[PDB]
Design a protein around this ligand. Sequence first.
Ligand code: HEM
Ligand SMILES: N[C@H](Cc1c[nH]c2ccccc12)C(=O)O
Length: 344
Amino acid sequence: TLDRVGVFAATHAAVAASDPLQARALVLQLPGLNRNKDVPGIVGLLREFLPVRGLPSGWGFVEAAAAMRDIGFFLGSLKRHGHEPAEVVPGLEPVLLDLARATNLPPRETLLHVTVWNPTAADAQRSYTGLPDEAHLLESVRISMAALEAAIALTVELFDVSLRSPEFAQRSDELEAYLQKMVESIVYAYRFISPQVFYDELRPFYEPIRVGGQSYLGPGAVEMPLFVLEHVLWGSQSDDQTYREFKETYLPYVLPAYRAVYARFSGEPALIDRALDEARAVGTRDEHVRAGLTALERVFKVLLRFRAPHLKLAERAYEVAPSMLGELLTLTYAARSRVRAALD
Ligand code: HEM
Ligand SMILES: N[C@H](Cc1c[nH]c2ccccc12)C(=O)O
């Protein structure tokens, strides 16, 4: 039904199938060492597969990203136990910088590496903790990542579609359907992840580390390129400084193609701004304008159906939540209100 997902899932699978360092059996031993708080052991295990003579010349994006995944779980782990990985693992930093170069991504593991680029099988899936709650956490992202990527494409396409065209309503309805996957992710996360286990056992693995003289944030669904989609959709011309800073903070962590989309739309009115302007010019007596606006409103509804429950999810875990969440929620409500005002 959501036919556009396939190509994105296939691209994810290529990295997930790659094991260029033959590290699968080794990384699977990491959870045990974490449980034992065995820092020398963790370093020792990493040094069993960490390249010491640079990267094999034949590697492309896929191998480099897969290598970063496998090294990456050791990064979050060492930091969890209170150590900067670059400080305790000799020769690690040059490898991380080389892998960053090869992938055009930060010099550590990101959400992509630990979720959609991470194989799904029990005898292959990499994990910090080996806990079922972590497996559920990763599953929650896998539910919606490909759909979100498809949704970014649909949003960019919709940008150039006239509100006067029947296509506007059709594409918006299609966009809504892909975004529904985000809602499904939160339902799954709320049902299957223990807040206590998340806060006490998982959260400590996602702390920032220092590489190349700056700090890089750990993996999180906050790195999902939803903020890029919404930049195009409603946020590009926002004067909200904190919101602007949020986007600029996470921009480095998303795929190069999405950083390019972000740049393309920064100096432009957002989709909503163009659509509402077109509606005032043409009038809502045009049925395609009415239907377009109504369909657009449903896109905002689904975004709110992700964002509101997510805030509850976050609050429950953190009661064992960051102000930015509430602030973004308020901005989203205001965006929807603009669409609703245009229909009155
Ligand atoms: C128990 C599970 C979860 C917890 C505790 C949690 C917590 C948080 C927190 C505290 C933030 C604010 C930024 C930060 O401090 O990192 C955030 C942001 C965010 N999270 Fe989650 N999260 C969870 C699950 C998820 C899931 C399953 C998804 C989607 C698959 C998701 C998507 C996002 C997105 C897109 C943001 C950026 C803000 C926004 O768009 O509203 N989170 N999360
Ligand atoms: N920081 C929150 C919660 C979180 C931390 N690590 C992961 C991994 C996968 C999904 C969510 C999270 C966030 O970014 O959503």
